């Protein structure tokens, strides 16, 4: 029998992953700090990667990639994209971003470029149109903040004149295969978007949690891929695959292939997989933009069963076998 331990009790995802594993009868759960585990479902901060992979006679696996924080922290994300030749300053799927610590590197020089043609100058951290409005908002907090171009012309679903974001769930296994969950989710704004009043930031922020209109056009402000594909067909004469999902598969591929040499556990004494949540935004020209990568993601209720089961087969039982696929492999 394989053994595992849980060290993140707030994991909705891996809460399931324990239950599905015990139900196989071939997995037993030790207590937190029992070092003789096969699998670690570890904490979010200060996970002790240095301690994995030194138990003789034990093949240890873990559900986090050491170093993946570089991609899953807004400050690091911007630094990564700017400084990696793989992505480069000429990156066509990441909005303009600058890191400004609270106490203007080249951010001013860009904002002044926009006064040359009075182009849209809406940014975010929060939303403002004057740099002084935003800049004086990051020193009021005290931590690092990043400001990014606001997509003033985003894609809105009618009926509703509404805003949304797409979250895709990606699994990377110990072989550094990239698995894209075929089921995605659009987190939808029930509020008709309008650019006159940013500070009424409820039609501007699409967070499931921030939309404390909840449930008008679609349940939980959540529209699934079958529904969104049909709309795109009926409305725009296209499909989710051609107009959106290609670009998403390209971005997901690019971001993870960038940091592969830094996080790969191919020749290491312990092994890593990790589930990521990529958050995209689609503008009016059917262009996909990468907003954030989330190293600790939460699944939509309808899909916990399917995804958590795919996590077992693909990331866990691939290394600890027992006695069509729900993922799309992004090839490299």
């Amino acid at each position: 029998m394989y053994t595992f331990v849980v060290r993140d009790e707030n994991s909705s995802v891996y809460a399931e992953v324990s239950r599905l594993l015990l139900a196989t009868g071939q997995w037993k759960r030790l207590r937190k700090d029992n070092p003789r585990f096969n699998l670690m479902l570890g904490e979010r901060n200060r996970l002790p990667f240095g301690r994995l992979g030194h138990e003789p006679g034990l093949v240890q696996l873990v559900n986090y990639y050491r170093g993946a924080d570089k991609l899953c922290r807004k400050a690091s994300l911007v630094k990564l994209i700017k400084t990696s030749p793989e992505l480069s300053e000429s990156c066509t799927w990441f909005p303009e971003s600058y890191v400004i610590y609270p106490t203007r590197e080249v951010f001013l020089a860009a904002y002044n470029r926009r006064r040359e043609g009075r182009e849209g100058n809406v940014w975010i951290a929060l939303i403002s149109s004057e740099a002084s409005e935003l800049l004086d908002f990051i020193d009021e907090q005290g931590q690092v903040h990043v400001i990014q171009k606001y997509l003033e012309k985003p894609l809105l679903l009618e009926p509703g004149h509404r805003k949304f974001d797409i979250r895709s769930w990606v699994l990377v296994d110990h072989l550094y295969n990239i698995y894209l969950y075929r089921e995605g989710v659009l987190r939808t704004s029930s509020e008709p978007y309008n650019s006159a009043n940013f500070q009424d930031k409820t039609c501007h922020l699409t967070n499931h949690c921030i939309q404390k209109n909840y449930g008008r056009y679609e349940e939980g402000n959540e529209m699934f891929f079958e529904e969104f594909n049909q709309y795109l067909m009926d409305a725009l004469n296209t499909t989710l695959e051609n107009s959106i999902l290609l670009q998403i598969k390209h971005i997901i591929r690019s971001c993870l292939m960038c940091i592969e040499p830094a996080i790969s556990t191919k020749h290491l004494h312990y092994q890593s997989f990790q589930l990521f949540g990529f958050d995209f935004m689609v503008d009016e020209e059917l262009k996909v933009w990468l907003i954030e990568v989330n190293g600790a993601p939460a699944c939509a209720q309808k899909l916990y069963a399917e995804l958590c089961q795919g996590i077992v087969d693909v990331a866990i039982s691939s290394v600890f076998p027992l006695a069509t696929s729900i993922f799309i492999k992004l090839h490299h």
């Binding site: 029998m1 053994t3 030790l30 207590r31 700090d33 029992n34 070092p35 003789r36 003789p56 006679g57 034990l58």
Partner: protein, 427 residues
């Protein structure tokens, strides 16, 4: 690094005699004291237990002690009786009467100094003395009472040497007298203070193994002592033969004993065998590993699954794959990590010896410091109170000068011992 052996009383001399029979055969020393052996592994560490006599003869570093001449005459009559050094027979004539007070305070007091003289003559010859091992039972008078009185005096003269005992605990399934729970409770109080390691050889376990596993309908002391000698050879292999660990009694205490009073080990053996009859299928290394950790192979009637292992020591004897031994031992810990304390990392050690014991091609000996041994002390403690709350049979003891308050203190000290073992079962 010589060891000094001491066997006291009927039980101590009987199991003590078999130990010297058994290990003499492993080291290729016959009753005459001469070495007629195949391998040089048999002589490399032979000085641990044997003195080298002129004519190149080997004499056990053994002291034979009793308050009665019966059993000691039996030893001398026996097959290896002539191997012992005649001056090391120290005996009285009155007998202890299954009375701890007689062994400790009165009849034993007269004989103790003569024993210490023989002990001293053997110690002065030792190049570097590890310490002492005593064989005795805790239910009689001499081995129990005088043995612990000897242990206290040896610690006074050799406070910086190791005290090791093979202590036979009493059981109603094999009992000579109702007063054995008194004798045992008084002795344990002493062992807790003056021994570094004591192997709890429980007569209840020896009986159940003979009855249940060996299908012996009516087991004798010889059937029990067959198990005891097999255990005593096994838990001595690392001392008597060369190995990677370079094992000695002090290092065993360091690694086995995290807290000084918790030094009572659960011995175990595999495969279990009845005397004479030899079975012809050698076991698989996986078979050795599971039987040795099986409750049915423990020489103390405790349930390892009612407690947690503080430290474990396993010794494999025979020609086998040390790679397989590693995997198998690693498999059992990882399989049952809940029965090993988590706060002592790497608390299971495995040693190997190429030479197997007579009759087996491969065997495994298990030494466990389990908190489940409290069950043994609970059992003896319950038998003690059942009589003590009525003061029954106390007159045998008070007549030799003992006081009721000494019994109360011994009862209490052992109950504390049980509390302390319980403390680490929940820790």
């Amino acid at each position: 690094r010589e060891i000094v052996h001491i066997q006291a009383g009927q039980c101590g001399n009987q199991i003590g005699a078999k130990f010297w029979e058994v290990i003499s055969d492993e080291h290729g020393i016959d009753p005459t004291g001469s070495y007629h052996g195949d391998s040089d592994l048999q002589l490399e560490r032979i000085n641990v237990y044997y003195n080298e006599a002129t004519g190149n003869k080997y004499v056990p570093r053994a002291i034979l002690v009793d308050l009665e001449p019966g059993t000691m005459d039996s030893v001398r009559s026996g097959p290896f009786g002539q191997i012992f050094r005649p001056d090391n027979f120290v005996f009285g004539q009155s007998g202890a009467g299954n009375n701890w007070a007689k062994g400790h305070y009165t009849e034993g007091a007269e004989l103790v100094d003569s024993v210490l003289d023989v002990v001293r003559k053997e110690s002065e010859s030792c190049d570097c003395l590890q310490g002492f091992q005593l064989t005795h039972s805790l239910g009689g008078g001499t081995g129990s009472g005088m043995g612990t009185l000897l242990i206290s005096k040896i610690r006074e003269e050799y406070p910086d040497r190791i005290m090791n005992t093979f202590s036979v605990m009493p059981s109603p399934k094999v009992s000579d007298t109702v007063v054995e729970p008194y004798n045992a409770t008084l002795s344990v109080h002493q062992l807790v203070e003056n021994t570094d390691e004591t192997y709890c050889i429980d007569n209840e376990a020896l009986y159940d193994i003979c009855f249940r596993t060996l299908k012996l309908t009516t087991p004798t002391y010889g059937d029990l002592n067959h198990l005891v000698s097999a255990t005593m050879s096994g838990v001595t292999t690392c001392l008597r033969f060369p190995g990677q660990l370079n094992a000695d009694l002090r290092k065993l205490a360091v690694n086995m004993v995290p807290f000084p009073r918790l030094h009572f080990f659960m011995p175990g053996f595999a495969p279990l065998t009845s005397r004479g009859s030899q079975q012809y299928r050698a076991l698989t290394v996986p078979e050795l590993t599971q039987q040795m950790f099986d409750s049915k192979n423990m020489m103390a009637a405790c349930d390892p699954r009612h407690g947690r292992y503080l430290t474990v020591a396993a010794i494999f004897r025979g020609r086998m794959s040390m790679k397989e031994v590693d995997e198998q031992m690693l498999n059992v810990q990882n399989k049952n990590s809940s029965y090993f304390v988590e706060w002592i990392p790497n608390n299971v050690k495995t040693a190997v010896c190429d030479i197997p014991p007579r009759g087996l091609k491969m065997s495994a000996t298990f030494i466990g410091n389990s908190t489940a041994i409290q069950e043994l002390f609970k059992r003896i403690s319950e038998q003690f109170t059942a009589m003590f709350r009525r003061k029954a049979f106390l007159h045998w003891y008070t007549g030799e000068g003992m006081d009721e308050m000494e019994f109360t203190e011994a009862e209490s000290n052992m109950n504390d011992l049980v509390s302390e073992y319980q403390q680490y079962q929940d820790a």
